[PDB]
Design an enzyme around this catalytic site. Sequence first.
Site, mmCIF file in Angstrom:
data_model
loop_
_atom_site.group_PDB
_atom_site.id
_atom_site.type_symbol
_atom_site.label_atom_id
_atom_site.label_comp_id
_atom_site.label_asym_id
_atom_site.label_seq_id
_atom_site.Cartn_x
_atom_site.Cartn_y
_atom_site.Cartn_z
ATOM 1 N N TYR A 112 9.844 17.427 27.540
ATOM 2 C CA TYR A 112 8.596 17.573 27.358
ATOM 3 C C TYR A 112 7.906 16.597 28.526
ATOM 4 O O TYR A 112 6.400 17.718 28.842
ATOM 5 C CB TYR A 112 8.568 16.213 26.227
ATOM 6 C CG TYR A 112 7.221 16.010 25.350
ATOM 7 C CD1 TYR A 112 6.713 17.029 24.586
ATOM 8 C CD2 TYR A 112 6.086 15.193 25.736
ATOM 9 C CE1 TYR A 112 5.998 17.374 23.884
ATOM 10 C CE2 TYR A 112 4.716 15.520 25.500
ATOM 11 C CZ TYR A 112 4.693 16.665 24.267
ATOM 12 O OH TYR A 112 3.250 16.033 23.880
ATOM 13 N N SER A 147 5.483 22.947 23.222
ATOM 14 C CA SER A 147 3.987 22.004 23.480
ATOM 15 C C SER A 147 3.608 21.768 25.038
ATOM 16 O O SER A 147 3.867 22.418 25.852
ATOM 17 C CB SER A 147 4.414 20.881 22.996
ATOM 18 O OG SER A 147 2.476 20.746 21.673
ATOM 19 N N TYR A 148 3.803 21.149 25.192
ATOM 20 C CA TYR A 148 3.624 20.553 26.876
ATOM 21 C C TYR A 148 5.268 20.768 27.770
ATOM 22 O O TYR A 148 4.921 20.714 28.923
ATOM 23 C CB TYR A 148 3.243 18.513 27.342
ATOM 24 C CG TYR A 148 2.475 17.956 28.604
ATOM 25 C CD1 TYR A 148 3.623 18.619 29.721
ATOM 26 C CD2 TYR A 148 1.175 17.902 28.417
ATOM 27 C CE1 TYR A 148 3.150 18.015 31.104
ATOM 28 C CE2 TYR A 148 0.854 17.708 29.595
ATOM 29 C CZ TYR A 148 1.745 17.691 30.669
ATOM 30 O OH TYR A 148 1.116 17.706 31.643
ATOM 31 N N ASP A 191 -1.418 29.505 14.997
ATOM 32 C CA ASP A 191 -1.418 27.748 15.817
ATOM 33 C C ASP A 191 -2.021 27.847 16.263
ATOM 34 O O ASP A 191 -3.306 28.138 17.159
ATOM 35 C CB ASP A 191 -0.136 27.663 16.997
ATOM 36 C CG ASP A 191 -0.463 26.430 17.820
ATOM 37 O OD1 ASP A 191 -1.044 25.896 17.166
ATOM 38 O OD2 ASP A 191 0.252 26.619 18.464
ATOM 39 N N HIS A 219 1.689 25.287 14.876
ATOM 40 C CA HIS A 219 2.547 24.783 16.371
ATOM 41 C C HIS A 219 3.691 24.377 16.511
ATOM 42 O O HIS A 219 5.069 24.590 17.246
ATOM 43 C CB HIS A 219 1.715 23.508 17.049
ATOM 44 C CG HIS A 219 1.766 23.270 17.712
ATOM 45 N ND1 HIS A 219 2.240 24.486 19.296
ATOM 46 C CD2 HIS A 219 1.927 22.595 18.445
ATOM 47 C CE1 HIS A 219 2.383 23.300 20.023
ATOM 48 N NE2 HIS A 219 2.412 22.422 19.880
HETATM 49 C C1 PS4 Z 1 8.981 13.378 24.413
HETATM 50 S S1 PS4 Z 1 7.956 12.619 23.408
HETATM 51 O O1 PS4 Z 1 8.927 12.183 21.976
HETATM 52 O O2 PS4 Z 1 7.877 11.021 24.127
HETATM 53 C C2 PS4 Z 1 6.711 12.354 22.660
HETATM 54 C C3 PS4 Z 1 6.526 14.451 21.976
HETATM 55 C C4 PS4 Z 1 5.301 14.774 21.730
HETATM 56 C C5 PS4 Z 1 4.428 13.778 20.683
HETATM 57 C C6 PS4 Z 1 4.610 12.348 21.554
HETATM 58 C C7 PS4 Z 1 3.274 11.557 21.110
HETATM 59 O O3 PS4 Z 1 3.237 10.662 21.956
HETATM 60 N N1 PS4 Z 1 2.805 11.668 20.213
HETATM 61 C C8 PS4 Z 1 1.167 10.825 20.090
HETATM 62 C C9 PS4 Z 1 0.194 11.436 20.447
HETATM 63 C C10 PS4 Z 1 -1.131 10.161 20.058
HETATM 64 C C11 PS4 Z 1 -1.555 10.438 18.747
HETATM 65 C C12 PS4 Z 1 -1.664 12.084 18.828
HETATM 66 N N2 PS4 Z 1 -0.097 12.600 19.793
HETATM 67 C C13 PS4 Z 1 -0.567 13.386 21.168
HETATM 68 O O4 PS4 Z 1 0.457 13.234 21.760
HETATM 69 C C14 PS4 Z 1 -1.368 14.855 20.326
HETATM 70 C C15 PS4 Z 1 -1.109 16.200 21.236
HETATM 71 N N3 PS4 Z 1 -2.259 16.844 20.740
HETATM 72 C C16 PS4 Z 1 0.011 16.272 21.209
HETATM 73 C C17 PS4 Z 1 0.476 17.946 21.919
HETATM 74 C C18 PS4 Z 1 0.323 18.929 21.468
HETATM 75 C C19 PS4 Z 1 0.041 20.202 21.853
HETATM 76 C C20 PS4 Z 1 -0.035 20.861 23.024
HETATM 77 C C21 PS4 Z 1 -0.375 18.649 23.303
HETATM 78 CL CL1 PS4 Z 1 0.296 18.898 25.592
HETATM 79 C C22 PS4 Z 1 -0.188 17.686 23.207
HETATM 80 C C23 PS4 Z 1 5.750 12.039 22.261
#
Ligand code: PS4
EC number: 3.4.14.5
Lengths: 728, 728
Positions: free
Chosen positions: B509, B592-593, B670, B702
């Site tokens: 990720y 995603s990322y 998406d 997505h």
């Molecule tokens: C590997 S991991 O387990 O650490 C992991 C994986 C995915 C997400 C998180 C996370 O912490 N999410 C919460 C945070 C705060 C509120 C919303 N938020 C986002 O990140 C929203 C973004 N729009 C998500 C997103 C969607 C599409 C493309 C990208 Cl580049 C990013 C952690």
Amino acid sequence: SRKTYTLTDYLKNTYRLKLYSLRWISDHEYLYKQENNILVFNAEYGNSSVFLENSTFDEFGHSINDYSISPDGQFILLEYNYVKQWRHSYTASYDIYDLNKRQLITEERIPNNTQWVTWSPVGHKLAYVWNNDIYVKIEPNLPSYRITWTGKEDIIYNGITDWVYEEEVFSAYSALWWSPNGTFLAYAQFNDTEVPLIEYSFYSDESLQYPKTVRVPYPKAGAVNPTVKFFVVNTDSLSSVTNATSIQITAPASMLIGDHYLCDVTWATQERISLQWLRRIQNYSVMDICDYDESSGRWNCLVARQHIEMSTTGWVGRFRPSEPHFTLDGNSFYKIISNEEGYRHICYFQIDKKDCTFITKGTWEVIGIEALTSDYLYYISNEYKGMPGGRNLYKIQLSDYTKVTCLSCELNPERCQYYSVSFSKEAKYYQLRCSGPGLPLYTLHSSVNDKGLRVLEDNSALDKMLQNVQMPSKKLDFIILNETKFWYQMILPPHFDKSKKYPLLLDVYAGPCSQKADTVFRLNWATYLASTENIIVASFDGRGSGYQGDKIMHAINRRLGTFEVEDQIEAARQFSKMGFVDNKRIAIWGWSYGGYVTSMVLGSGSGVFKCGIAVAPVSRWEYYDSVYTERYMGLPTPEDNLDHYRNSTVMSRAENFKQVEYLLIHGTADDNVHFQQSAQISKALVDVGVDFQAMWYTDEDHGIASSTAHQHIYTHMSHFIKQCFSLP
Amino acid sequence: SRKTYTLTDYLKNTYRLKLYSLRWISDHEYLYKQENNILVFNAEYGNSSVFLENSTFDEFGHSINDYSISPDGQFILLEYNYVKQWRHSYTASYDIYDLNKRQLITEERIPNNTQWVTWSPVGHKLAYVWNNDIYVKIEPNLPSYRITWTGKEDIIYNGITDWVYEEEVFSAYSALWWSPNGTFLAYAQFNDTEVPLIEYSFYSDESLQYPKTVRVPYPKAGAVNPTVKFFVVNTDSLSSVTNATSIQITAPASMLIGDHYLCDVTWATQERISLQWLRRIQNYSVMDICDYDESSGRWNCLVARQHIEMSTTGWVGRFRPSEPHFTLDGNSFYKIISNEEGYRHICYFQIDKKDCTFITKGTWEVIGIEALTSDYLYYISNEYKGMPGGRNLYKIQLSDYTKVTCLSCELNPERCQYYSVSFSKEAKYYQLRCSGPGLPLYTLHSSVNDKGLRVLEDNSALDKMLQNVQMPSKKLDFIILNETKFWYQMILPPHFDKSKKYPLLLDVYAGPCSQKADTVFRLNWATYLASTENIIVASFDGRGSGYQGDKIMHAINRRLGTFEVEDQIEAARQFSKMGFVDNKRIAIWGWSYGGYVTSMVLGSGSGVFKCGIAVAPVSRWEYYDSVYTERYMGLPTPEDNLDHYRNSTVMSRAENFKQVEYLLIHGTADDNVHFQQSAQISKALVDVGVDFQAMWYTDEDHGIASSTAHQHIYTHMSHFIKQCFSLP
Ligand SMILES: CS(=O)(=O)c1cccc(C(=O)NC[C@@H]2CCCN2C(=O)C[C@H](N)Cc2cccc(Cl)c2)c1
Ligand SMILES: CS(=O)(=O)c1cccc(C(=O)NC[C@@H]2CCCN2C(=O)C[C@H](N)Cc2cccc(Cl)c2)c1
Ligand SMILES: *[C@@H]1O[C@H](CO)[C@@H](O)[C@H](O)[C@H]1NC(C)=O
Ligand SMILES: *[C@@H]1O[C@H](CO)[C@@H](O)[C@H](O)[C@H]1NC(C)=O
Ligand SMILES: *[C@@H]1O[C@H](CO)[C@@H](O)[C@H](O)[C@H]1NC(C)=O
Ligand SMILES: *[C@@H]1O[C@H](CO)[C@@H](O)[C@H](O)[C@H]1NC(C)=O
Ligand SMILES: *[C@@H]1O[C@H](CO)[C@@H](O)[C@H](O)[C@H]1NC(C)=O
Ligand SMILES: *[C@@H]1O[C@H](CO)[C@@H](O)[C@H](O)[C@H]1NC(C)=O
Ligand SMILES: *[C@H]1O[C@H](CO)[C@@H](O)[C@H](O)[C@H]1NC(C)=O
Ligand SMILES: *[C@H]1O[C@H](CO)[C@@H](O)[C@H](O)[C@H]1NC(C)=O
């Protein structure tokens, strides 16, 4: 051991077929671009000179895409800033260059973003279309005249066709028709107000932050159709004080009774037009003949001259009612029509009189009418040797219909079995061109005695080039199905051994009036698959196929997705029982209508096919356009033919795809078979749990014909077939 | 000898994690759904009563999706006709059920297509948003008062978030904030008038003839953002005669100078709200304290009370500035702030005093403040044994900051190393929730002497079942990179022989503040890949990852697609050097990322990876939303960071994809990472003649979370990886 015909050879165009593209400018002269100079040729004597040097526009400062010389040879039209729209439509910039005073024209120029330009067929008059409006120039250096003021983007089209009429009706963006004199301009107007719009995304270059949306007026089966109106302008009575007056010719009373199309316009004489109209239910057509009233300035279409063309077994015409070919005086014409037995033949019509007189007959079909003189009618047909995939030029004596001479049959019987023709004005000379089964041959002939004057192009350089390649051979034959003869071809690997077993790819199209088994010489993907990979590429012409009578062609009427699919499988079944075909390795592929058949065949559960590729397929007939679909399917209503609209989707066969390896491909910017069609297929396979292979080509339309995408699709497909066939 | 964890087991959910979801309603009671009956539980003694039977609502006519009881236990909300919008947003119908009357209230109903509903924190006042406008009901059977009149679809949003705010800021649809008394209602308002619309096709059921175009106001990196306003309503002074009068709280002067956001809203006491604003360049955060006035009926946000939070190394907070946790009198609060050494710790602020005091310190981080009394603050942190991917509950004596007790460390050290917590009102009781590395364990505790009361769910039915299957094991360790410690995890096949060689999947990720190496127990794709396929699935937290201080996390500031990529290659390189991983068979996949990092990795030319999968990837930072992208990349203009916007795309690395096997997968619907992003990757690969594999998912967003699409994608990715590894 020498080299094979590679994928790179096909894709990169290593071996080019020579052509001989000539332009008749009188009864004994044509133009032809040798290297880059335009040369004028004398047909009788073969002598030539320079018309225009390659170096006349060295300091022009625009990439010159095309040219058109005026009939009198006084002016040249130059076409630059070419931007493609649909199959035939485009916009461009134009310039006029005077040939007597060697200079460009700078006063009152043609606008940028012109939709269509044409010279009057005599002299140097110009008609063009700009922002959906018709403009006329008498002189190239004088101000143009505004004819219409109604033009409006995506709603009103004056002198140009809308999407459906371009694709399905006229095979042209142009809706302009000069009288042979040049005196009159006949044109059509299309109204697309209530036509629903197809919307899709266009992503453009990387720099484009947000994707664009494309909106096209496009009627799917059953939807609201564009209306049409027909006009005629007297161009000799145009002034810059008064606004232009156009005379409207309305449709016959038997057309105004419902939805209808304008399907043909052919000028008879200087003062007489012939128009054909078609009912929305495309089994009824009316030819109307209209005369100019000198005193009134009007056009009359007398009921006495009305001629009906009908079908009880299917639709009128092959894809539309055929063109008339008038005698000089315009009081009679000739026309291909289905006869009592369902075979298409030349009928002799007399303007004022009922019925018609057939001047040909037999279990073969006339392909086209080519030329008319007071003594002879010249036509292309498939009579010779009962070969429907063959084509020769014939000639009928008008004073005795029994005297029919073949002019191309015995010229080169081993190399040449498929001809077309280009006649000079008044039909004194003709260029014959054969395209197979050998290399293309271009020759010049003379109508007086049918003496052969000159070989123009014999593709000699290509001959010696392919002699050093391990080239594949072609086999044309037929099989019997229900006591009827159906024709096939096979593209056969070099050093073909009938005691060895070869995998087989079925090349399919099989739409109504199609023909995939003929005598044409082709250099294609199938050429590479056979020569390098040693795969037999077979093609079959089943029920619904063309040029063999209405019994075969109309079998598919109201029943698309039935017999054409069934017969594809029966053909593959018979090929598999042959001693040189490996029954463990049979595949199927097709594009367009062929991708629909391919998927239908793959979802059939026959067990004959291991794998298949479908490229830009139709899935459900309600998604495709009104003019094409309704020709064969009627309306998708309970009263009409909804039951078979719903019986014949790819989606309903999803479960059977578990039995095969499937590759689905579609361009995202496809304005013809919309991405929707494949998008719907994949949904149904995903919802049913079938694994398959997908490929989208972004911003590519139906052809997927950008050099990079072209190369990428055939490469991707080649890897799929080789892995399907256990080929390293 | 035993069976293995199959793909079916995963996809069909054969082995199920039992949960214990509870809702504290008092300082000593909680609600719980046991076999579709809602029960109330006494915490100390463990007895229960049935609040609402499963049999009631047998004749309701609609399937109940959710429920929400009054704080006073007098009314229950019934959610039905549920229709999902984005991640948190949805539309629904609501019926109120009077408990003392045992009958549904039949008039003055909450409308259909209601966007959000809430009770007040005490009593039974209702607030709901319908058609983008706020309404309030004082009594459930009484007519509702209209609060706002300016709501308009896609343009003005009262009480609910628009797209960016929903996704990136609040992680909620709600923009409604009830006073603890229930006296005041605070809401936000968003103005998307000038925000560009993203448009994409929606194909729907096969019965839809023309595709639908979906249009969402979605600001991309550098585009115009929504503007925001804050208001507070007095619910106790509402009249039938007059409209409600809202009072506005204006943003601080340092925010009004340019583009800004509202990032946090937290009521302190009955007459005090704290707001937090954020500059568009997310460098600068301000907290504002606002007191109510009995006389004027206004609010006051005194400039002396404003607390500023800055960063010069990066952005503020983990994703946004952290929320304040106030004491009962509301004169002081605690908030997680980045310290002088880069590590996130708890800070004690006093409202009229300028600075704060640190209560915790060390080379670890506080994850979240959880509960507060006069005597103790309770928080989760990763201090234990120095493991950043571990999570434990701690307890700070407020009179002596050095007195810190771990409450969860020793409860079961072998099974339990990742905890979360839920506290009763006034933190009298807490439920602990264990997540790994063993099976999840739910317990109840008393805060007085931190006594273990009851085991609520221990998942022993899962444990007996898992003894029958060949389960993989987890490996949690670190490696050294330029003299710093970086953590990874590995899922290892059953009967792991360190002398053998295994193929390796790098699960990535690597987003800013991500953690993919931890102690939690997961049943997923990786489980099946190890158990049945004998693939080591690894994960790694390099530069840019969270919970290890700003030095690691901010390393990626203004430079996305650089260090987080390199460190994945470098980690994979070090993984190969090990004697149990086969260097000829290393794969990489992400979503995603993670799809973007994967894509960047495959296009780096490192030659370390044989193949990879990217699912719904970013490809260029300009295509993504402002709030998120700009947080880490700044603005995409020449004056700012356009350079590394253009430097960090997948498209510029296209040539290098010649060395690898790539698989690209995107949903067409998406709304988050738009299909556009993949569409551009694919085009670029074609543009330079690179073969690759592709997959679109029709109507999926997505998540690709529809049952059949979910099954299909994982089935498809399994086949791609098996063949990449020569696994039969
Ligand atoms: C590997 S991991 O387990 O650490 C992991 C994986 C995915 C997400 C998180 C996370 O912490 N999410 C919460 C945070 C705060 C509120 C919303 N938020 C986002 O990140 C929203 C973004 N729009 C998500 C997103 C969607 C599409 C493309 C990208 Cl580049 C990013 C952690
Ligand atoms: C096998 S074959 O080599 O004999 C072959 C293959 C393809 C076309 C023809 C053909 O005769 N075309 C001429 C007729 C009349 C003018 C326009 N026209 C069309 O057919 C246009 C249709 N819209 C084509 C089309 C496009 C997309 C989807 C479908 Cl289902 C159909 C023949
Ligand atoms: C061909 O030769 C004749 C006789 O010299 C000449 O008059 C004629 O213009 C020539 N035509 C061409 C096209 O060169
Ligand atoms: C077409 O555009 C070009 C370039 O902008 C300009 O020079 C020219 O004037 C235009 N043509 C006409 C005749 O308007
Ligand atoms: C186009 O058609 C609409 C009816 O569908 C009509 O109202 C309009 O006047 C038409 N335009 C012209 C110029 O014929
Ligand atoms: C538990 O039992 C006590 C003692 O009878 C009772 O007062 C209380 O209401 C019970 N709690 C619940 C929620 O049943
Ligand atoms: C809400 O929708 C339902 C459909 O289930 C309809 O019957 C009802 O009349 C609508 N209006 C109310 C009562 O809120
Ligand atoms: C929303 O913003 C626009 C300018 O973008 C402004 O004209 C309009 O009045 C605003 N609407 C409200 C209700 O805030
Ligand atoms: C010419 O006639 C058309 C309508 O027929 C009109 O739109 C245009 O303005 C006229 N030009 C003038 C002013 O003569
Ligand atoms: C409702 O509760 C009963 C009795 O406790 C239980 O047996 C049944 O399974 C439940 N039914 C539903 C719909 O969950």
